[PDB]
Amino acid sequence: ERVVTIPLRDARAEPNHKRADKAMILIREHLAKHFSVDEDAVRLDPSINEAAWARGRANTPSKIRVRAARFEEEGEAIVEAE
Amino acid sequence: SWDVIKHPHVTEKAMNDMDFQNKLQFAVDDRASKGEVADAVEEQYDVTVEQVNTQNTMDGEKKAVVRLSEDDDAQEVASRI
């Protein structure tokens, strides 16, 4: 478990009316990488969902501090706002 | 010669009408009037018919909802057939 800062600028590669969706993807990919786990095994607490969609589908925050824990027999992570 | 009462219409909705409103339901001849249905019923089970409501069904038959007087008990009447 640790606190990480996820940059979401790569969401700008996606059409602007759908930045929120892409952000949620970048978050899952960032965590899976940095906590060495499969993306399928990363759980995003709704808090993170609300953070990214705060200003609607077309306005994601540039970064987001997220608190994630890693564990269990198969290796998985759980994340949430901070 | 066609008879008036064809057969009892037994379904959940019918049972409720019988248990909660002292009403009996029958499939009757589509040429029978509310009055002819009232008579036939009184003469077949010996009871007092108070009201009769009818409906020409999408099954091609006429359905009758016959309410009996408080003096009679539908549940018991129907229980002997």
Binding site: - | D30, N56, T57, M58, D59, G60
Partner: protein, 46 residues
């Protein structure tokens, strides 16, 4: 629309006919309703 009593009888018959060929007929004839109709895809008379 408004259906007369006779129209109603006819619609009723069409509905009834629109059923499966009983399972037991299958066995007895050792192996399909050709008059199967759909309310949307088909059109009844009148």
């Amino acid at each position: 629309g408004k259906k007369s009593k006779a129209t109603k009888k006819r619609l009723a018959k069409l509905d009834n006919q629109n059923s499966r060929v009983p399972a037991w007929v299958m066995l007895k004839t050792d192996r399909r309703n050709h008059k199967r109709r759909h309310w949307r895809r088909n059109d009844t008379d009148e």
